[PDB]
Amino acid sequence: NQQIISVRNEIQELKAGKDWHDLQNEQAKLNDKVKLNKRLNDLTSTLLGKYEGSQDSEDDSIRDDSNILDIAHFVDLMDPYNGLLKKINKINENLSNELQ
Amino acid sequence: RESSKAAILACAAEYIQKLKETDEANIEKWTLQKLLSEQNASQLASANEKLQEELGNAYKEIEYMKRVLRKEG
Amino acid sequence: RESSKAAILACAAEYIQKLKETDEANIEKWTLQKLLSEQNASQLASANEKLQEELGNAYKEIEYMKRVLR
Amino acid sequence: STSDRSELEDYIVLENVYRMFGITFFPLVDPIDLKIKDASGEIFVDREMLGIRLEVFSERTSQFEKPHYVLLKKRIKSNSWFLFKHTIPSFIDVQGIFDDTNGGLVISHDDAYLFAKRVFLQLVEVQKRRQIFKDLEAKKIIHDLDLDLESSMVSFFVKDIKVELFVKQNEIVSCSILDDIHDFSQNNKSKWEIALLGSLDDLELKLNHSFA
Amino acid sequence: RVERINGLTNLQKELVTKYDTLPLLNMNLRLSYLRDHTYPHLQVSVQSRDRVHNDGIEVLVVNYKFCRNTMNPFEIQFKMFYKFEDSTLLKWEILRISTNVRLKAKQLLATRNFQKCLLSLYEFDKIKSKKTGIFQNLINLLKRKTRCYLMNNSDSLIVERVIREGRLTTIKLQINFIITMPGERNCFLPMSKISIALWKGGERFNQIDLDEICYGLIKEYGVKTGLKEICNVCLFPDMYAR
Amino acid sequence: ELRLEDNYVPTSDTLVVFKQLMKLPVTVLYDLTLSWFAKFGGSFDGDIYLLTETLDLLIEKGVRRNVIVNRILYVYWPDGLNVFQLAEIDCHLMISKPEKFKWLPSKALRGDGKPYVVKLQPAKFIENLQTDLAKIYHCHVYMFKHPSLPVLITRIQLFDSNLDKFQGKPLISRRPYYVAFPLNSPIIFHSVDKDIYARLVLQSISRTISERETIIFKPVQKIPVKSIHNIMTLLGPSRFAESMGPWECYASANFERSPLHDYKKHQGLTGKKVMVREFDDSFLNDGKEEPEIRRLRLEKNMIKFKGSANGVMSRYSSLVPIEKVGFTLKNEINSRIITIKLKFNGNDIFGGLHELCDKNLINIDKVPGWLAGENGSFSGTIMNGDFQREQ
Amino acid sequence: IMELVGDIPKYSLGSELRNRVEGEPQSTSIERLIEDVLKLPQMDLKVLSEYSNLRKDLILKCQALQIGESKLSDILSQTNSINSLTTSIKEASEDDDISEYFATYNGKLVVALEEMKLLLEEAVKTFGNSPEKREKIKKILSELKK
Amino acid sequence: QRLQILDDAIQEKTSELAEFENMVRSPSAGDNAIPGLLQIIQSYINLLEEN
Amino acid sequence: YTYGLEPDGPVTFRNDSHELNLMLNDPIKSTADVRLDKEEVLSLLPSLKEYTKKSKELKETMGQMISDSHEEEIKEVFV
DSSP states (O other), rough: OOHHHHHHHHHHHHOOEEEHHHHHHHHHHHHHHHHHHHHHHHHHHHHHHHOOOOOOOOOOSSSOOOOHHHHHHHHHOOOOOHHHHHHHHHHHHHHHHHOO | OSSHHHHHHHHHHHHHHHHHHHHHHHHHHHHHHHHHHHHHHHHHHHHHHHHHHHHHHHHHHHHHHHHHHHHOO | SSSSSHHHHHHHHHHHHHHHHHHHHHHHHHHHHHHHHHHHHHHHHHHHHHHHHHHHHHHHHHHHTTOOOO | OOHHHHHHHHHHHHHHHHHTTTTEEEOOOOOGEEEOOOOOOOOOEESOEEEEEEOOOTTTTTOOOEEEEEEEESSSSSSSSEEEEOOSSSTOOOOHHHHGGGGGGOEEEEEEEHHHHHHHHHHHHHHHHHHHHHHHHHHHHSSOOEEEESSEEEEEEEEOOOOEEOOOEEEEEEEOOOOTTTTHHHHHHHHHHHHEESSSHHHHHHHHHOOO | OEEETTOOHHHHHHHTTSSSSSSOOHHHHHHHHHSSSSSEEEEEEEEEOOEEETTTEEEEEEEEEEOOOOTSOOOEEEEEEEEEEOOOEEEOOOEEEOOOGGHHHHHHHHHHHHHHHHHHHHHHHHHHHHHHHHHHHHHHTTTTTTTEEETTTTTTEEEEEEEEETTTEEEEEEEEEEEOSSSSOOOSSOEEEEEEEEETEEEEOOOHHHHHHHHHHHHHHHHHHHHHHHHHHHHHGGGGGG | OOOOOOOOOBBBBBHHHHHHTTOOOOHHOOOOOOOHHHHHHOOOOSSHHHHHHHHHHHHHOOOHHHHHHHHIIISTTOOOOOOOHHHHHHHHHHHOOOGGOOEEEEEEETTOOOBBOBOOOOOHHHHHHHHHHHSEEEEEEEEEEOOOOOOEEEEEEEEBOOOOOOTTTOOOOOOOOEEESSSSSSSEEEEOOOSHHHHHHHHHHOOOOSSSSEEEEEOOSSEETTTTTHHHHHSSSSSSTTTOOGHHHHHHOSSOOOOOOOSSSSSSHHHHHEEEOOOOOOTTOOOOOOOHHHHHHHHHHHHHHSTTTTTOOSSSOOOOOOEEEEEEEEEETTTTTEEEEEEEESOOOHHHHHHHHHTTOOOOOOHHHHHTTTTTOOOOOTTEEEEEEEE | OOOOOOOOOTTTOOOHHHHHTTTTTBBHHHHHHHHHTTTOOOOOOHHHHHHHHHHHHHHHHHHHHHHHHHHHHHHHHHHHHHHHHHHHHHHHHSSOOOHHHHHHHHHHHHHHHHHHHHHHHHHHTTTTTTTTTTIIIHHHHHHOOO | OHHHHHHHHHHHHHHHHHHHHHHOOOOOOOHHHHHHHHHHHHHHHHHHHHH | SSSOOOOOHHHHHHHHHHTTTOOOOOOOOOTTOOOHHHHHHHHSSSSHHHHHHHHHHHHHHHHHHHHHHHHHHHTTTTO
């Protein structure tokens, strides 16, 4: 009855330690860094030829941002309050007032 | 801030061995730092010198500038 | 090792103090030579960025080549 | 005088208008930290103290909920803040947020406002759940219910079926349906339980649709 | 001695008499904590304030000015009615908006819960200012070594260098910093996004690896130094081979 | 397998349980016994309606409690009550006389040192804990909520077999153990006992709560606390925690009303009054006095020891009375560290100090906050003007 | 016989799996399911083959999920922007007139520019300086800074 | 089934986007006149703020 | 920073994120080199092809409108 409680307490104690967390976090950081080094070397070589790889094509466009960019630009242009036509009306009236 | 003498002694021993352990890692990190720093310095020096000779090729291309200029005036 | 308990504790205190001092000492020299290496790298980079800038500006002369062949 | 009583009027009306923002710094001090400068016979405060008030607009009543407060003090040597007293409940780890901000070296009032905004959003993420659940109760979309303090685990009877939910901020992450009904086969149960997951804003709509 | 204090009390005597811990009631102090310690660059003023004593309802019309961008501050005006008793709001109305932000803020102001609208407008202003700051710093770091063109109504910029590996081989990079107003799907605040694009000789590089490069380098070095360093990588490899 | 059920009967001394029963009023006895007969019946012959009218006619005749207790212990259930009833009587005893029981706090932590806000559905917890405990000891577990607090309370009792005895086959009882859970907080409350059985119990709760990530309990205080109300106030999820002592009004939060509140009654227009302090130390030097200034001096003492002029809870009784505190000042003078360790004992340390301040044996302006009551219930060391809880 | 096991052992598989395999989980959480199934290890031979194929298919399924929500959020932001613009034009016009709003955009531009021209060709061209032409040219630039 | 109920939402939103695409559509050939007028305007714009 | 002298970089990013409320391109989870492939996800979510082509059609309509407006040229004289 003593021994079982002792071993259970040890089991609980082990998994809550700081080192157990720190080692896993460090390993994740190592993996991230090595992947980053791989990618940077690959892309700089691709920029400089002598690449001996792929990293140079757009056969698919599943991941993209041009959509939101393009529509935000258009919405800014078509704005009924800041649109180019509203702008030109304001400046036209200002110039007319200046002239007359 | 331990209170009991036994706790004081135990904490003192733990603190002593922790300091001893920390010193070795602190020593070890410096060699890696030296390696990284000298690697970066050598890389930057190589960049500077090969940019100097790339600019040498560029002044040869400025001799070609000067030829294209003679070929028109 | 030594006999009296009070002597043991006093030696422990001395040991802790010298450990702290030794751990403190090395940082200074490491940081000083680190700083010297850092500023050497900094001035070499200050020259390298020049070399960069006139190499880039040389494309104006490259235009002076290839815009003759308009 | 007459001017003072009448101009306090507009200034505090603007102060209302500023409490209309929710996150609201307010001043504070600690009595024991006052001392004398020994030559001018003048008093001064040793350690600065900042107060934050945390008001959330209750659209359910068009009033504001009972506010929350968090209070910060400066260390003696470090010239940096530390979390001394606060009203924020313990399930909001304000100390951890403070230690996370700027690596723990909270100095600037901008860092303090970052910390304050974090705790305020964390409080709004509680009131936002409580408001919608009480709204569902009010319109009889659900029968009686019981809530935990932070409104993260919630139990309710819809008509006769009863459900257990565990929600993060704005989102349901797990669901459980407990009652047994003739039409409530395991496949029916499973697809109901799966459909109940997602953002909380759609829960009212989908529950009303799945009324039967 | 004994003193009577109120919202107008001098802070010095409030402090000298301070043996409690309650909030300091000094009223301009609360207003300042609100106005220039949690909402700096928010120049607000109440335009009308009459209360209808017969109905017992306060009537307000209050005007705001957000001046993070002093070159073109945007403004807004709320009319507002509350019960003046039992602490309840009746209604509020946006009487006026500066045209420069009308559309971009309308969806936010279409939402109720004024707290959301006002403080989100505030954070929108500061985030726009920071966006412009990041771009201008990058432009400064690159201007003379590589001329560079801000475009898409200040949302994205372009940089360029001519690779010398091949004869006049060009390399082209452009970056995006888009700010999105809230309203739909997690929070209620304005939020921003970064993405980059690269070309060599007009040939676009696959965007997955480029995005992950952006991700990693920004996380390692922040947006500022991270993006300066992105430009170092992409616009200066030939120097960099070793 | 070894999980017990409600119909089993333990063994114990009859006189002790009789004395326990005598504490309860007549009405609760009537209710408990009606429920027990409804669920289990009894040796008595007749319908519950017959039992109802017998108990009635017994009570309108003004019979004494002894008759009912003797009936319960000698005719209705003469051989002994069930484990369920034994747990129920202790539940009622705790609810009726909360101040008779002691508690200790314990904090739940996860791997990264963060607080783990425990959120608990009772069914999974109880089944898992019962299955975990049954493999080692015979365990009966009873769970209930406090009538007036947001806390779930559990009673755990362990049994073992048989001094000498023949084939009667009972299981002898043992002193019980208690645990409590606030709804949303990292803290746990449990009884004060360090026998191996309590350790086994607490370890079993720590094991069973987890279900997705490891969990460990870290004690935060070494001296017990009474009266579950008080420990809930001190460390439960509430506004008073980290706003104790002079800082209680923020926990009250009634000083400030919502902004849309009426103008003319907003307290800012109306204000309040306070006393001016004195800083040149005339305390040790030395009826020639008048009422008003003395009144506000007493108010000053009140707020310094209570945090509000009206004195939010006699004038000395404090919010949560503290029986023991041990402090240790560490100050540097001429590059020499000096230790002073104060030890206080009583029923309310800070109330007594407040009384001494009223009698003018202590100078209010030189009482530090930690001595006034903030960091309440925490003994600790003060360095650099910052309180630090003892390890 | 302690050691012989022709199966995976217990406690080596996520909570959702050790619940579902032996009984009804009493609750569901897709996020828990995906971060549990992502832990499943590599390994009769037919059972092993179906295990590997099914696990790979499941990993691809949750990857497809994640990709889907990633695109979904951007689509929602887009639709919000378009809704804002459409509402603005709808209220500005007070009728639909929206296809012709976009079409007559360029026509309105050219007519606005020529009616501008007939006065600006002196009001700013003959002024020939930013300060001299302030009210028109500098106003245009200041508005170009909004 | 989760993937399917993502998929249906993507169809719905793409239908909205297609509706707006049909909304904005209109023909155009004479952009050259606008370009010439804009060049004429750019003449004065440069005369004012060519810097 | 990580191993030379035990940072400024990651903490700078954290503050930038908490002050900007900044999106950034998240990675994609994987296991045992079970990496994403475009064909499988595109088949499992058929919608993405329709989304791509109709967003394209939208983009060409919007772009030809923009070019006919010459807004880029009109704004170039204000850059």
